[PDB]
Design a protein around this ligand. Structure first.
Ligand SMILES: *[C@@H]1O[C@H](CO)[C@@H](O[C@@H]2O[C@H](CO)[C@@H](O[C@@H]3O[C@H](CO[C@H]4O[C@H](CO)[C@@H](O)[C@H](O)[C@@H]4O)[C@@H](O)[C@H](O[C@H]4O[C@H](CO)[C@@H](O)[C@H](O)[C@@H]4O)[C@@H]3O)[C@H](O)[C@H]2NC(C)=O)[C@H](O)[C@H]1NC(C)=O
Ligand SMILES: *[C@@H]1O[C@H](CO[C@@H]2O[C@@H](C)[C@@H](O)[C@@H](O)[C@@H]2O)[C@@H](O[C@@H]2O[C@H](CO)[C@@H](O[C@@H]3O[C@H](CO)[C@@H](O)[C@H](O[C@H]4O[C@H](CO)[C@@H](O)[C@H](O)[C@@H]4O)[C@@H]3O)[C@H](O)[C@H]2NC(C)=O)[C@H](O)[C@H]1NC(C)=O
Ligand SMILES: Nc1ncnc2c1ncn2[C@@H]1O[C@H](COP(=O)(O)O)[C@@H](O)[C@H]1O
Ligand SMILES: Nc1ncnc2c1ncn2[C@@H]1O[C@H](COP(=O)(O)O)[C@@H](O)[C@H]1O
Ligand SMILES: *[C@@H]1O[C@H](CO)[C@@H](O)[C@H](O)[C@H]1NC(C)=O
Ligand SMILES: *[C@@H]1O[C@H](CO)[C@@H](O)[C@H](O)[C@H]1NC(C)=O
Ligand SMILES: *[C@@H]1O[C@H](CO)[C@@H](O)[C@H](O)[C@H]1NC(C)=O
Ligand SMILES: *[C@@H]1O[C@H](CO)[C@@H](O)[C@H](O)[C@H]1NC(C)=O
Ligand SMILES: [Zn+2]
Ligand SMILES: [Zn+2]
Ligand SMILES: [Zn+2]
Length: 374
C-alpha cells in the first residue's frame, strides 16, 4: 500500500533553490526526482492552484477561479482575505482527492491545506486541522506524523506552510532579504525529513514537495490606476491585482470596456468570451464579464490608496517566474533524476496511480509523468 505526503511551501518559485544554499532540497534531489518547469494554472494564486493539485482540473472546471470570487447564480461572494471560504457550494463543482481516497476505504490527513477544513460533498478529510496560520510548522509536522502512524493511519497527507509567499510579497523576490526565508524553508524541510526518519516513514512514504506558484517583483513605478480611466461608481471590482475581475453595473459594460481597453499598454482587457483558450479560465459563471490582466511585474490599483506589495503573483501561467518547485522522494520515485517539464494538472493522475485510486475525470495525464517512477 503506497503512501503519499504532499507538501506545499506557498509561493516557492522554481529557481529559489539557487538563491542560497538549500542542502535539504538538494538531499531530496540527489535521492529523488526534480522537475525544472511546472506549468501551473491561471490565475496563479493559492486557491485555484491548490485545488488543481487535488482535482487534476483547470480552474474553469473545478470552479475555484480566484481567491476572491462572486458567483452571480448563488449571489454569494468568496474571499480569502476575510476567511470567507467555507461555503461548500464554491467547492462542489469538483471532488478533491481525499474524498475519493476515503470512498476507497483509506484515510486522509490535512494540516492547513487550502480547502481541507471545508465541508465538500458532506465530507472532510478523515483528519484535519481548522485553518490557523499561527500554528507552527513543527506542530503541523507533528500532526502529519501522528496521522501516518495512528491506530487508524492515513495513506495520504497534505501539509501546507505560508512561506516563502508571505515574505516574498513583503520584500519582493529580488530582495536580498529573500535568502533568509528560503534558508529557513530549507531548514524546515530538513526538520520534516528528520521527523519522517525518526518515525520510520522516510523510506515508505512518497514525499512530494511543491508549491502553488512563484513570485515576481513589483514597483511603484509600474502601477495601473483604474480611477484614471473608470468611474468607480459604475463597476464592482471582484478581484484586484494582477487579474482585475470587473463586474460593470447594469448598462455600463460598453462604458467600462471602452474606457479600459487599450488605455494602458500593460493592462490587457478581455471580454469574458475572448479570454485566451490556453488559460482554460472562461467557461465558468464565476469568471466576470471583463477580466483585465496586468503584464508581469505591473500592479493594478483601484485608486491611490489601494494595496501595493513588492512581490506578487497571479500573472500569466506561461511566465517562468510564476512556476513552482517540484521535487519528490520515496519508494515509488526514481533517484537522482531530473525531468524538464510537467503540468501541475498531472499531479492528480500521479497521486491516483500511487494510491491505486480510480481518478475522476481530469485534465492531466499519467503518461506525462510516468517517467518519474521507479
Ligand atoms: C509593458 O508595455 C510596454 C509598452 O509600453 C512593453 O514594451 C514593449 O516591449 C516590446 C517587446 O515586447 C518592444 O518591442 C521590441 O522593440 C525592440 C526595439 O526596442 C527599442 O526601440 C523601441 C522603438 O522601436 C522602443 O519603444 C523601446 O523602448 C526600445 O528602445 C525590437 O528590437 C523588437 O523587435 C525584435 O524582436 C521581436 C520579438 O520580440 C521580433 O519579432 C522582431 O523581428 C525583432 O527581432 C520589438 O519590436 C517595444 O519596443 C516595447 N515598448 C516600449 C515603449 O518600450 C513591455 O513589454 C510591457 N511589459 C511587460 C512586462 O510585458
Ligand atoms: C444578493 O445578496 C446581497 C446580500 O449578500 C451580500 O452581498 C452579495 C453581493 C454577496 O457578496 C454576498 O456574499 C453577501 O453576503 C443582497 O444585498 C442586499 O441588497 C439590499 C438592496 O437590494 C440592501 O438593502 C439596501 O440597503 C441600502 C443601504 O442601507 C438601502 O438604502 C436600501 O433601501 C432602499 O431599498 C429598500 C429595499 O427595497 C427600501 O425598503 C428602502 O425604502 C430604500 O428604497 C436597501 O435597504 C441590503 O443591505 C443587502 N443585504 C445584505 C445582507 O447585505 C442583494 O439584495 C442580493 N441580490 C439579489 C438579486 O437577490
Ligand atoms: N482558510 C484560510 N483562511 C484565511 N487565509 C488562508 C486560508 N488558507 C490559506 N490562507 C492564506 O492564503 C495566503 C496565500 O494566498 P496566495 O497569496 O494566493 O498564495 C496565505 O498567506 C495564507 O495565510
Ligand atoms: N434583471 C435582469 N434579469 C435577467 N437578465 C438581465 C437583467 N438585466 C440584464 N440582463 C441580461 O443582460 C443582457 C444584456 O443587457 P444590457 O446589459 O442592458 O446590455 C440582456 O439581454 C439580459 O439577457
Ligand atoms: C489560532 O491559534 C492561536 C494560538 O495557537 C490562537 O490565539 C487563535 O485564537 C487561534 N485562532 C482561532 C480562530 O481559534
Ligand atoms: C479609494 O477607494 C476606497 C474604497 O471606496 C475609499 O475608501 C478611499 O478613500 C479611496 N481613496 C482615495 C485616495 O480616493
Ligand atoms: C501539458 O499539457 C499540454 C496540453 O494538454 C500538453 O500538450 C503538453 O505536452 C503537457 N506538457 C507536459 C510536460 O506534460
Ligand atoms: C478538462 O477536463 C474536464 C473533465 O473531463 C473537461 O470537461 C474539460 O473539457 C477538460 N478541459 C480541456 C481543455 O480539455
Ligand atoms: Zn500562494
Ligand atoms: Zn501570495
Ligand atoms: Zn499569510
Amino acid at each position: 500500500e503506497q503512501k503519499v505526503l504532499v507538501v506545499s511551501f506557498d509561493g516557492f518559485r522554481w529557481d529559489y533553490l539557487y538563491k542560497v544554499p538549500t542542502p535539504h532540497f538538494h538531499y531530496i534531489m540527489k535521492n529523488g526526482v526534480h522537475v525544472n518547469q511546472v506549468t501551473n494554472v491561471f490565475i496563479t494564486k493559492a486557491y485555484p492552484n491548490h485545488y488543481t493539485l487535488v482535482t487534476g482540473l483547470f480552474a474553469e472546471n473545478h470552479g475555484i477561479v480566484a481567491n476572491d470570487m462572486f458567483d452571480p447564480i448563488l449571489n454569494k461572494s468568496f474571499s480569502l482575505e476575510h476567511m470567507d471560504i467555507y461555503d461548500s457550494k464554491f467547492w462542489e463543482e469538483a471532488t478533491p482527492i481525499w474524498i475519493t481516497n476515503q470512498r476507497a476505504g483509506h484515510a486522509s490527513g490535512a494540516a492547513m491545506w487550502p480547502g481541507a477544513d471545508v465541508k465538500i460533498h458532506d465530507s472532510f478529510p478523515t483528519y484535519y486541522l481548522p485553518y490557523n496560520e499561527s500554528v507552527s510548522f513543527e506542530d503541523r509536522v507533528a500532526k502529519i506524523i501522528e496521522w501516518f502512524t495512528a491506530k487508524d493511519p492515513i495513506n495520504l497527507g497534505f501539509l501546507y506552510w505560508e512561506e516563502p509567499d508571505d515574505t516574498g510579497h513583503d520584500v519582493g523576490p529580488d530582495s536580498p532579504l529573500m535568502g533568509s526565508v528560503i534558508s529557513d524553508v530549507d531548514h524546515k524541510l530538513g526538520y520534516l525529513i528528520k521527523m519522517l526518519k525518526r518515525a520510520k516513514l522516510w523510506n515508505n512514504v512518497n514525499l512530494i514537495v511543491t508549491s502553488d506558484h512563484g513570485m515576481t517583483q513589483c514597483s511603484k513605478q509600474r502601477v495601473i490606476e483604474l480611477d484614471r480611466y473608470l468611474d468607480k461608481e459604475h463597476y464592482t471590482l471582484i478581484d484586484h491585482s494582477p487579474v482585475a475581475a470587473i463586474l460593470p453595473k447594469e448598462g455600463k459594460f460598453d462604458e467600462v470596456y471602452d474606457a479600459l481597453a487599450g488605455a494602458h499598454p500593460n493592462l490587457t482587457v478581455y471580454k469574458k468570451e475572448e479570454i485566451p483558450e490556453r488559460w482554460h479560465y472562461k467557461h465558468n459563471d464565476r469568471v466576470q464579464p471583463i477580466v483585465a490582466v496586468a503584464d508581469e511585474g505591473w500592479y493594478i490599483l483601484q485608486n491611490k490608496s489601494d494595496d501595493f506589495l513588492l512581490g506578487n503573483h497571479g500573472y500569466d501561467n506561461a511566465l517562468a517566474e510564476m512556476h513552482p518547485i517540484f521535487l519528490a522522494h520515496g519508494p515509488a520515485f526514481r533517484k537522482n533524476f531530473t525531468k524538464e517539464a510537467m503540468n501541475s494538472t498531472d499531479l492528480y493522475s500521479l497521486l491516483c496511480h500511487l494510491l491505486n485510486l480510480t481518478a475522476l475525470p481530469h485534465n492531466g495525464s499519467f503518461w506525462n509523468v510516468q517517467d518519474l517512477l521507479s
